[PDB]
C-alpha cells in the first residue's frame, strides 16, 4: 500500500519495538 516498506516499517518497527513492545521484543 505504501512506497518504501522499510522507513515507516523500520520506524514503526524500531519505534513500536523500541517504544512499545520492546519487552515483548526483548522477551517475546
Q: What experiment produced this structure?
A: NMR
- Taking phi over 0 as left and psi of -120 to 50 as alpha, with beta for the rest, 4 belongs to beta
Residue 24 dihedral angles phi and psi, to the nearest 5°: -60, -15
For cell 515507516, the residue is 8
The C-alpha atoms of residue 3 and residue 11 are separated, in whole angstroms, by: 14
Give me the DSSP letters along the chain. --S-SSHHHHHHHHHHHTTTSHHHHH--
Determine the straight-line distance between the first and last CA of the chain, rounded to whole angstroms.
28
User: Nearest CA to 19 among 2, 4, 10?
Assistant: 10
Those residues whose C-beta lies under 8 Å from the C-beta of residue 21, and which sit 6 or more positions away, are: 28
Residue 4 dihedral angles phi and psi, to the nearest 5°: -75, 110
Amino acid at each position: 500500500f505504501s512506497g518504501p516498506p522499510g522507513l515507516q516499517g523500520r520506524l514503526q518497527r524500531l519505534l513500536q519495538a523500541s517504544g512499545n513492545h520492546a519487552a515483548g521484543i526483548l522477551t517475546m
